């Protein structure tokens, strides 16, 4: 505590009452003559000290860019495998090898290498750090076994490490080292502690003040990341560090959004995201955390820099996804940690502009080689649609989606979201607007009445077929009764109501009218939407409030209106109701009354975009 | 958050705590402990500020108001900040006669002060008098009337300060004040209209407005927005206001909707506006679209609930 060493690289005298040796050192650093006056051995010692202080980002005193050198941090899995394959020349090479094995999911080999280094390492700093990391990898192996209860570790190995690590105390490790080590390496004692990021987490509270701190927080986060990755420490993978990164980045982005909002309020017209920030968010955030960030702050207003580096990182993520799942691959220990980072990276790639080739690689990996368990068809479509935000759909991505749809047809869908293969075709039709699928047409030409599952699958994908394919597909389905007509309209059998469909709807409505003493609401919606021009629906008025609310609002009694109707309405229906020039003030007043009664988010959203 | 609608439990314990803080404020500032002051003044200020939402008994309210007005240092609490505190206190409990008497004594002390008033938010003792007049509009400041009776023309400070507190006086007391004080500058005209002595501007008032605008114009190469509000709400028909646009953004916004570019509009302006002119802006139809856009953007990006209630009651 003689001096303060700040995150920006400046030194400040703090507590030493003796000579200013750091100020003196900087003075020799500035001027070569004073440096030349040193003795030869002291001159070379000063050269070593200057190299150290340059490497560690210590420049000068107060009166006078992040760069992490780690293959593990940058996700260079192939280069890490190459480094592991080669023969280690030193024990520091073995330490780096054991860290790389830990990061590649090969925890048994990592534990064996750490044990070997501990054997062959008795400064004793690599010995101490291997003891730290072997305990950490032993903790990782122990917790992975509990999660899996697949047998990725043999029971012999588990029993052997349990016997080796029984009664082992990491709290005694530093105190068991020679006192020379304990004096020289007092700064490494925190690595044996259960927690080491409490100071930073408590200091994060300054990002919540509403009355620089943010740059200090970011630089300290970069310092922690560089120390834990460049020194090959396995604590960089545990929940404490990931939680610390999540908290720091989330609070920084929320603080920047708060300053942006306050300035907009007070001035009426902040956070800069770069490659390292993108990698930190991808590796440490879950999808829920990114969703919290998106809902809390406008990430679309955050400028993304170093987009070439981010694109290269995303392409590497896609390539590793392919290598993990195109071939046998499937290191379950590595896959468990890697799939979360890949999901977060592809999810966050919505805000990053991507080149055509890189976008092609990423989209291909996402559509085909991403496991269904981690990303179902609905989540996969959500990721793709997010990818279509910054960059519109080119021809190559449309072709990749076409191949995905062809593969789906050949296979023929469990979707937690509720979006299926039809939405990919809708997305294609959104941009190309005239895309016809050659192979889908070919498989329609081979379709028969036997394979009903194919028919009921790609009847939803009808706009991507040709005229002959559409005509052939239409033959296998009948529209005899009203139920068949409703199944067709929900599946897309007909897009323009024929007069016989109108007669069928009339028959259904008359039959229900006779039996007076779900479908009717849809009929009223279609009548309002000009979908049906029968001009006869007025006789079915009186039963359902929605029916007369939709067929003719002029005579509708708005005391029978339920505000919950608007929640079920879609974008097109709400926009049409807004522009009707009738019914408008009634929905305005009912929505105003609803929101004044209770600040409901969906109702305000409806009232705000289309003004209904 | 609407903290006002949140109910407060243990109102008696809260009031006892508030009265204890008021008593400590009185005791400290009369020999004080400065290092204790640093920690305690923040808590006392926050408690007095947050006491807006808590029902206070008449005796406790009296003690709290007395401490806030008299013994709260001017360094921590400006006269405008102190008025804001007191006005917040009067929100939950309408100020009784004892509170009126206490703040009247504060007013007469402030009158004695001028015998030789910095507000960060521009709210002064005339506003304490206005808060007096907002309730029981039949009230007389006897001590202030006595001060008004003995007003020689040489002691300008007392008379010019007391002219702001016109409704607090009597006819006989205000006779001497009107004998000396009269509308002669733009400041006199604006504080007179805020009192309400003259409801309709004389042409000479428009002349002073135009000459003040001309002077600040020759200075070009704070009450700018008041003239814009007067032109928008057509209390000024001089029609020469259009020759001094490009001066302040609020002025440009209010004198002309179409010529005022909407990118320099400050969304926070709508919170200062009152209900009358806020409704008038909605019906103008010449600036309705851009205030609608600003309100929507603020509902999106800001957590402030004021913008939503501005949008939905007035539909600006």
């Amino acid at each position: 505590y003689d001096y303060h060493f700040e995150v920006n690289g400046t030194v400040v005298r703090h507590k030493n009452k003796g000579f200013g040796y750091m100020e003196r050192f900087f003075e020799l650093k500035e001027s070569c003559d004073e440096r030349s006056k040193l003795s030869k051995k002291q001159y070379e010692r000063f050269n070593a000290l200057f190299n150290f202080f340059e490497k560690n980002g210590v420049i000068c005193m107060a009166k006078d860019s992040i760069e992490i050198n780690s293959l593990a941090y940058h996700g260079k899995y192939d280069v890490m495998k190459k480094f592991i394959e080669e023969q280690s020349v030193s024990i520091e090479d073995d330490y780096k090898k054991a860290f790389f094995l830990a990061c590649l999911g090969r925890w048994e080999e990592s534990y064996d290498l750490y044990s070997n280094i501990i054997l062959n390492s008795i400064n004793g700093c690599v010995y101490y750090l291997s003891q730290i990391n072997r305990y950490r990898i032993y903790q990782s192996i122990t917790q992975a076994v509990t999660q899996f209860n697949y047998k990725p570790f043999t029971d012999e190995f588990l029993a052997r490490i349990e016997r080796e690590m029984t009664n082992f105390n990491i709290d005694d490790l530093f105190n068991g080292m020679p006192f020379e080590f304990q004096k020289k390496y007092k700064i490494l004692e925190f690595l044996s502690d259960n927690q080491f990021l409490y100071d930073d987490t408590v200091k994060l509270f300054e990002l919540t003040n509403k009355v620089s701190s943010d740059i200090v927080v970011l630089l300290r986060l970069y310092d922690n990341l560089r120390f834990l990755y460049e020194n090959c420490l396995w604590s960089v993978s545990f929940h404490e560090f990931h939680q610390y990164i999540r908290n720091s980045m989330s609070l920084l982005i929320e603080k920047a959004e708060y300053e942006r909002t306050r300035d907009i309020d007070e001035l009426g017209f902040g956070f800069f995201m770069e490659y390292y920030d993108f990698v930190n968010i991808s590796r440490h955030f879950k999808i829920d955390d990114i969703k919290n960030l998106e809902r809390s702050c406008s990430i679309d207003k955050i400028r993304f820099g170093e987009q070439e580096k981010i694109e290269e990182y995303l392409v590497g993520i896609a390539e590793e996804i392919t290598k993990q799942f195109s071939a046998n691959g499937m290191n379950v220990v590595f896959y468990t940690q890697f799939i979360s980072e890949a999901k977060a990276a592809l999810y966050f790639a919505k805000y990053v502009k991507l080149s055509e080739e890189g976008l092609g690689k990423i989209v291909k990996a996402l559509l085909f080689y991403f496991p269904e368990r981690d990303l179902d068809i609905g989540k996969r479509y959500v990721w793709l649609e997010r990818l279509t935000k910054c960059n519109e759909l080119p021809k190559s991505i449309i072709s990749i989606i076409d191949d995905f749809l062809v593969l789906q047809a050949e296979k023929h869908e469990v979707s937690s979201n509720g979006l299926y293969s039809r939405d990919y075709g809708a997305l294609i039709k959104h941009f190309e607007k005239n895309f016809i699928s050659k192979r889908l047409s070919e498989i329609t030409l081979c379709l028969t009445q036997d394979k009903q599952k194919q028919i009921d699958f790609l009847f939803k994908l009808l706009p991507l077929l040709s005229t002959n394919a559409k005509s052939h597909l239409l033959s296998f389905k009948s529209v005899e009764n009203i139920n068949d007509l409703m199944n067709g309209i929900r599946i897309g059998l007909i897009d323009e109501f024929t007069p016989e469909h109108e007669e069928l709807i009339i028959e259904y409505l008359e039959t229900r009218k006779v039996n007076y003493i779900d479908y009717m609401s849809t009929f009223g919606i279609w009548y309002f939407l000009e979908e049906i021009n029968n001009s006869k629906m007025e006789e079915f008025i009186g039963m359902d409030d929605q029916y007369d609310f939709f067929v003719d609002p002029e005579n509708f009694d708005y005391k029978k209106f339920i505000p919950s109707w608007l929640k079920n309405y879609n974008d097109k229906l709400l926009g049409k109701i807004a522009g009707n020039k009738h019914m408008k003030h009634h929905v305005i007043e009912v929505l105003k009354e609803r929101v004044k009664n209770s600040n409901d988010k969906r109702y305000l959203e409806i009232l705000m975009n289309y003004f209904i | 958050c609407s903290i006002d609608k949140i109910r407060f439990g243990e109102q008696e314990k809260i009031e006892e705590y508030l009265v204890g803080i008021a008593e400590e404020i009185t005791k400290q500032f009369s020999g004080m402990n400065v290092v204790f002051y640093t920690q305690f003044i923040s808590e006392a200020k926050a408690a007095l500020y947050f006491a807006k939402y808590v029902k206070l008994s008449e005796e406790g309210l009296g003690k709290i108001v007395k401490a806030l007005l008299f013994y709260f240092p001017e360094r921590d609490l400006d006269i405008g900040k102190r008025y804001v505190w007191l006005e917040r206190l009067t929100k939950c409990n309408e100020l009784p006669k004892s509170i009126i008497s206490i703040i009247d004594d504060f007013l007469v002390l402030q009158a004695e002060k001028h015998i030789d008033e910095v507000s960060s938010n521009g709210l002064y003792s005339r506003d304490y008098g206005a808060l007096i007049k907002h309730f029981e509009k039949n009230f007389i400041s006897k001590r202030l009337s006595e001060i008004t009776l003995c007003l020689t023309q040489d002691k300008q400070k007392q008379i010019d300060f007391l002219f702001k507190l016109l409704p607090l006086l009597s006819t006989n007391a205000k006779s001497h004040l009107l004998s000396f004080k009269s509308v002669e500058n733009i400041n006199d005209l604006m504080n007179g209209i805020r009192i309400g002595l003259i409801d309709e501007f004389t042409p000479e008032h428009e002349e002073l407005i135009i000459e003040y605008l001309e002077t600040r114009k020759v200075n070009y190469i704070d009450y700018m927005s008041t003239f814009g509000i007067w032109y928008f709400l057509e209390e000024i028909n001089n029609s020469k206001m259009e020759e001094f646009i490009g001066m302040d953004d609020q002025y440009d916004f209010f004198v002309d909707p179409e010529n005022f570019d909407y990118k320099k509009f400050i969304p926070s302006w709508l919170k200062n506006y009152n209900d009358k002119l806020l409704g008038k802006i909605a019906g103008n139809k010449h600036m309705k679209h851009h205030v609608i856009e600003v309100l929507k953007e603020r509902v999106k990006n800001s957590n402030d609930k004021r913008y939503l209630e501005i949008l939905m009651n007035y539909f600006i």
Side-chain angles (χ1 to χ4, degrees):
Chain A
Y1 314 101
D2 282 351
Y3 292 84
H4 287 310
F5 289 81
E6 298 310 321
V7 277
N8 57 300
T10 50
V11 195
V12 157
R13 199 201 200 81
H14 173 213
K15 278 183 64 163
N16 80 311
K17 286 326 117 186
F19 194 61
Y21 51 90
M22 278 297 321
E23 296 92 323
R24 193 53 201 156
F25 170 86
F26 283 130
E27 288 167 18
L28 296 93
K29 181 197 165 195
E30 313 284 356
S31 41
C32 189
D33 38 309
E34 328 193 43
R35 174 187 327 127
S36 319
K37 309 198 253 83
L38 304 160
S39 145
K40 186 72 225 63
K41 162 180 133 130
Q42 265 56 241
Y43 177 74
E44 84 145 284
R45 286 177 157 212
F46 174 88
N47 285 340
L49 288 180
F50 166 76
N51 281 344
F52 174 91
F53 280 122
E54 196 176 38
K55 194 168 111 153
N56 274 250
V58 180
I59 308 108
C60 60
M61 305 273 318
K63 78 182 145 262
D64 199 285
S65 81
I66 173 60
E67 205 267 329
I68 308 193
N69 305 290
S70 195
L71 290 172
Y73 180 79
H74 293 272
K76 302 308 183 164
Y77 302 121
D78 282 342
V79 197
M80 285 153 82
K81 288 162 200 163
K82 281 168 226 144
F83 179 81
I84 292 166
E85 277 154 20
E86 303 166 359
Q87 207 264 135
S88 148
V89 196
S90 54
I91 214 184
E92 290 90 44
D93 268 4
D94 271 331
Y95 181 80
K96 211 218 260 189
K97 256 183 193 52
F99 182 67
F100 283 1
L101 288 161
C103 287
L104 283 176
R106 307 150 62 160
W107 292 353
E108 181 173 357
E109 332 198 17
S110 173
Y111 186 96
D112 292 338
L113 210 28
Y114 279 128
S115 286
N116 171 21
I117 299 157
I118 284 150
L119 291 162
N120 315 354
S121 50
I122 16 180
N123 46 171
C125 156
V126 66
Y127 162 78
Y128 172 81
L129 291 186
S130 308
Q131 292 257 44
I132 301 285
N133 275 3
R134 200 179 56 168
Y135 189 64
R136 294 318 172 195
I137 205 77
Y138 162 73
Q139 289 183 313
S140 273
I141 286 156
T142 280
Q143 298 161 10
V145 162
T146 299
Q147 175 256 280
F148 278 127
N149 296 343
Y150 210 127
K151 227 56 73 193
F153 311 103
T154 80
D155 326 295
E156 169 200 23
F157 164 74
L158 293 182
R160 173 175 57 108
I161 63 180
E162 226 60 51
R163 151 175 70 258
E164 286 193 47
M165 282 295 192
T166 189
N167 212 28
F168 176 82
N169 203 25
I170 189 138
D171 306 315
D172 207 33
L173 173 64
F174 192 79
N175 288 331
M177 308 282 309
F179 57 90
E180 215 65 24
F181 178 91
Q182 306 186 37
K183 183 208 44 189
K184 295 169 166 191
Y185 296 95
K186 187 104 227 167
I187 59 151
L188 293 187
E189 192 177 23
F190 82 102
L191 286 163
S192 63
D193 284 3
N194 266 37
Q195 306 153 336
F196 62 105
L197 297 157
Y198 44 89
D199 229 303
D200 316 277
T201 307
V202 170
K203 169 198 118 293
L204 281 184
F205 268 129
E206 305 279 17
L207 298 171
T208 54
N209 295 350
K210 303 139 162 33
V211 157
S212 161
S213 87
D214 42 298
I215 194 68
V216 148
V217 161
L218 193 59
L219 284 194
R220 228 193 263 310
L221 172 135
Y222 286 158
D223 225 30
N224 285 326
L225 270 159
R226 189 167 185 205
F227 177 79
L228 289 187
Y229 267 107
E230 292 202 358
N231 283 301
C232 292
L233 296 155
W234 189 232
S235 61
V236 87
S237 72
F238 283 102
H239 174 78
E240 208 224 331
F241 186 72
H242 283 235
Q243 193 177 220
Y244 157 71
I245 302 274
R246 238 141 35 205
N247 289 337
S248 308
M249 294 306 300
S250 299
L251 287 187
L252 281 165
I253 289 161
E254 293 163 0
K255 167 123 172 297
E257 155 92 349
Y258 176 85
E259 327 280 29
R260 219 196 81 256
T261 296
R262 276 301 103 190
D263 286 4
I264 272 174
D265 214 80
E266 302 164 16
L267 277 286
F269 307 94
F271 194 67
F272 187 40
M273 201 99 59
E274 298 203 284
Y275 167 72
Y276 284 85
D277 303 306
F278 191 93
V279 176
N280 292 343
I281 285 159
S282 314
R283 178 160 311 144
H284 307 93
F285 284 61
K286 298 297 190 177
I287 300 301
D288 321 62
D289 300 309
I290 310 186
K291 262 150 176 153
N292 294 353
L293 259 186
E294 294 183 301
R295 72 166 173 58
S296 94
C297 328
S298 320
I299 316 193
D300 337 47
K301 297 297 153 293
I302 290 183
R303 179 185 65 191
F304 270 77
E306 277 174 289
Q307 261 158 12
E308 323 305 326
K309 274 183 133 273
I310 295 170
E311 157 134 26
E312 175 191 5
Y313 167 74
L314 292 167
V315 164
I317 284 272
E319 287 169 3
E320 186 68 14
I321 271 293
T322 302
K323 284 191 213 49
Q324 278 293 123
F325 309 104
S326 174
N328 178 25
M330 247 315 307
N331 189 325
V332 85
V333 186
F334 167 76
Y335 150 89
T336 298
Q337 61 209 0
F338 172 67
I339 206 61
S340 175
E341 171 172 6
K343 275 171 62 170
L346 295 195
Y347 189 76
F348 218 48
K350 145 177 180 202
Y351 307 105
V352 161
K353 181 81 176 68
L354 299 163
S355 77
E356 203 275 276
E357 37 283 45
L359 184 56
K361 294 209 204 323
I362 292 160
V363 163
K364 181 164 207 302
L366 153 76
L367 288 188
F368 301 105
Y369 308 77
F370 222 103
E372 253 285 329
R373 41 185 189 286
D374 315 291
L375 224 63
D376 63 66
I377 191 136
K379 303 255 217 63
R380 175 177 338 255
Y381 169 69
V382 161
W383 267 231
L384 169 59
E385 212 286 329
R386 277 172 69 88
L387 273 197
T388 67
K389 168 228 187 232
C390 265
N391 25 355
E392 311 88 33
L393 225 40
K395 182 60 220 83
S396 325
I397 308 308
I398 290 162
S399 145
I400 293 185
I401 306 175
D402 185 68
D403 315 348
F404 176 70
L405 286 172
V406 167
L407 241 192
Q408 284 325 289
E410 302 188 359
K411 177 237 172 273
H412 277 214
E413 290 200 338
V414 213
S415 152
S416 40
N417 161 341
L419 293 170
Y420 303 89
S421 278
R422 167 244 291 292
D423 306 287
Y424 298 79
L427 185 58
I428 276 190
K429 259 309 180 281
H430 183 301
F431 288 98
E432 200 84 326
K433 102 149 180 72
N434 38 272
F435 191 75
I436 264 52
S437 35
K438 314 283 118 177
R439 281 126 76 204
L440 289 194
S441 317
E442 286 182 13
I443 74 105
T444 54
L445 295 174
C446 191
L447 276 177
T448 62
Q449 199 101 32
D450 163 271
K451 35 215 173 170
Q452 274 295 334
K453 76 214 270 163
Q454 267 100 321
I455 325 285
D456 61 58
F457 164 75
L458 80 153
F459 216 167
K460 289 164 273 202
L461 289 179
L462 79 149
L464 294 150
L465 284 318
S466 34
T467 62
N468 54 54
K470 276 169 176 74
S471 292
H472 182 213
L473 207 56
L474 286 179
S475 83
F476 298 91
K477 292 280 187 186
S478 86
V479 70
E480 311 282 316
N481 62 15
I482 184 75
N483 262 76
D484 289 3
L485 174 62
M486 293 285 111
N487 201 26
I489 195 46
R490 301 330 300 181
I491 207 179
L493 200 149
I494 307 266
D495 285 68
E496 162 77 297
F497 263 120
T498 67
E500 59 104 354
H501 296 154
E502 144 191 85
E503 267 181 316
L504 214 56
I505 295 165
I506 287 168
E507 172 189 344
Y508 185 71
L509 291 192
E510 293 226 338
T511 46
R512 219 149 162 148
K513 160 150 149 187
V514 165
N515 296 8
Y516 167 45
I517 273 300
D518 169 45
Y519 294 132
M520 42 172 327
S521 271
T522 83
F523 303 150
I525 293 187
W526 284 320
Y527 184 93
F528 164 76
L529 277 185
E530 294 308 318
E531 186 58 39
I532 315 169
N533 202 3
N534 184 211
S535 175
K536 178 252 165 199
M537 293 285 192
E538 48 265 35
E539 45 81 33
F540 205 47
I541 293 188
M543 158 90 222
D544 206 78
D545 302 319
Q546 186 153 8
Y547 187 90
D548 49 335
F549 160 82
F550 263 110
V551 294
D552 54 344
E554 295 76 32
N555 81 322
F556 179 56
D557 189 18
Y558 297 91
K559 322 293 158 186
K560 309 289 209 51
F561 180 85
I562 302 81
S564 318
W565 287 345
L566 301 140
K567 282 181 157 171
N568 323 325
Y569 300 164
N570 59 93
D571 191 299
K572 164 205 179 32
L573 178 50
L574 289 164
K576 286 316 219 70
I577 295 193
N580 192 52
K581 194 88 150 70
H582 281 21
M583 215 181 345
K584 172 259 313 175
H585 52 247
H586 299 281
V587 284
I588 291 323
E589 57 99 352
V590 302
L591 270 186
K592 271 219 313 163
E593 188 260 359
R594 158 71 66 259
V595 168
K596 286 173 199 163
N597 287 22
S598 55
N599 257 1
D600 282 35
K601 266 57 78 203
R602 176 29 165 190
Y603 286 124
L604 185 46
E605 158 50 63
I606 281 177
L607 192 167
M608 275 216 326
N609 288 338
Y610 331 85
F611 272 135
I612 351 113
Chain B
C1 317
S2 99
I3 306 207
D4 16 291
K5 288 151 190 123
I6 296 185
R7 88 169 218 81
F8 263 92
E10 316 192 56
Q11 303 261 24
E12 305 71 52
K13 282 191 92 197
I14 290 171
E15 163 162 6
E16 156 185 357
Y17 167 76
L18 287 163
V19 169
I21 261 165
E23 292 295 339
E24 188 78 356
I25 265 184
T26 288
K27 281 202 31 166
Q28 283 288 304
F29 312 148
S30 39
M32 62 93 108
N33 202 332
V34 65
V35 298
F36 165 76
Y37 155 102
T38 68
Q39 60 215 222
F40 168 68
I41 221 67
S42 171
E43 163 173 17
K45 207 180 145 211
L48 266 275
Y49 191 74
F50 207 48
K52 155 183 174 201
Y53 314 97
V54 152
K55 250 294 308 186
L56 287 170
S57 84
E58 306 60 51
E59 208 226 358
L61 191 33
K63 299 182 151 202
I64 281 152
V65 160
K66 160 262 310 173
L68 155 73
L69 287 187
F70 290 59
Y71 306 68
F72 216 111
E74 260 292 332
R75 153 172 67 260
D76 295 293
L77 224 60
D78 289 23
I79 203 141
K81 290 205 147 134
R82 160 166 11 236
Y83 166 73
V84 162
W85 264 232
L86 185 122
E87 200 248 7
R88 267 164 75 78
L89 280 175
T90 59
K91 163 258 190 152
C92 251
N93 334 333
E94 278 72 15
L95 76 177
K97 207 81 202 196
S98 318
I99 294 320
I100 286 168
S101 100
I102 295 280
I103 88 177
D104 201 321
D105 317 337
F106 169 73
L107 277 172
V108 310
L109 270 276
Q110 216 46 229
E112 291 172 84
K113 147 59 166 55
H114 292 285
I115 217 66
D116 171 43
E117 269 214 3
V118 218
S119 166
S120 320
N121 59 114
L123 256 163
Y124 299 89
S125 318
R126 50 135 164 175
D127 309 277
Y128 301 62
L131 182 49
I132 291 263
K133 278 324 276 287
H134 184 31
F135 304 81
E136 61 111 13
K137 297 90 43 195
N138 333 96
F139 180 78
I140 169 66
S141 47
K142 295 92 47 180
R143 271 63 39 69
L144 283 201
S145 299
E146 298 170 15
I147 302 297
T148 326
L149 295 189
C150 336
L151 278 193
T152 62
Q153 338 297 335
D154 78 309
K155 44 171 68 192
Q156 174 63 92
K157 271 180 197 85
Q158 329 315 119
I159 322 163
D160 65 50
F161 149 77
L162 200 159
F163 162 84
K164 257 151 300 181
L165 299 150
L166 201 36
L168 263 282
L169 326 160
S170 39
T171 83
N172 267 16
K174 84 170 40 68
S175 299
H176 196 170
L177 183 94
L178 295 179
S179 78
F180 181 53
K181 299 298 302 176
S182 198
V183 35
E184 59 90 28
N185 58 44
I186 184 53
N187 169 36
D188 290 356
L189 154 78
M190 66 163 159
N191 50 41
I193 69 100
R194 226 176 268 180
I195 298 150
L197 201 66
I198 39 63
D199 325 312
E200 208 281 300
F201 298 93
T202 71
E204 271 207 77
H205 301 156
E206 265 99 328
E207 263 213 30
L208 306 121
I209 293 158
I210 211 70
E211 79 90 17
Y212 176 56
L213 294 203
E214 216 294 282
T215 51
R216 179 45 194 157
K217 210 282 166 302
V218 316
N219 282 59
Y220 181 62
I221 319 107
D222 204 339
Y223 28 88
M224 263 319 117
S225 57
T226 324
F227 307 123
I229 214 63
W230 287 334
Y231 192 83
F232 168 71
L233 271 194
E234 52 89 49
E235 311 105 298
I236 299 186
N237 45 13
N238 182 31
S239 189
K240 310 301 148 297
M241 302 275 82
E242 313 267 359
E243 87 208 353
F244 292 136
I245 324 168
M247 264 198 87
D248 197 302
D249 299 31
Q250 204 132 192
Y251 195 3
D252 299 32
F253 157 76
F254 268 130
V255 65
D256 48 64
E258 69 274 24
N259 301 333
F260 166 78
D261 79 88
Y262 298 141
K263 281 75 51 185
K264 49 160 60 42
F265 187 87
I266 292 203
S268 92
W269 290 341
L270 303 144
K271 310 199 276 88
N272 309 59
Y273 302 154
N274 62 67
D275 47 26
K276 165 51 189 192
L277 76 74
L278 225 36
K280 272 303 280 263
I281 293 171
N284 196 224
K285 166 272 311 171
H286 216 135
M287 41 186 126
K288 163 157 202 166
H289 46 287
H290 95 274
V291 288
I292 272 283
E293 196 71 20
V294 163
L295 282 197
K296 267 190 307 143
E297 173 264 291
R298 280 285 82 189
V299 169
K300 272 57 145 196
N301 306 8
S302 79
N303 309 305
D304 202 333
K305 56 167 175 148
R306 159 94 263 202
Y307 297 123
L308 199 49
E309 97 170 79
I310 290 206
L311 210 164
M312 276 219 209
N313 307 41
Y314 310 124
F315 227 133
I316 329 183

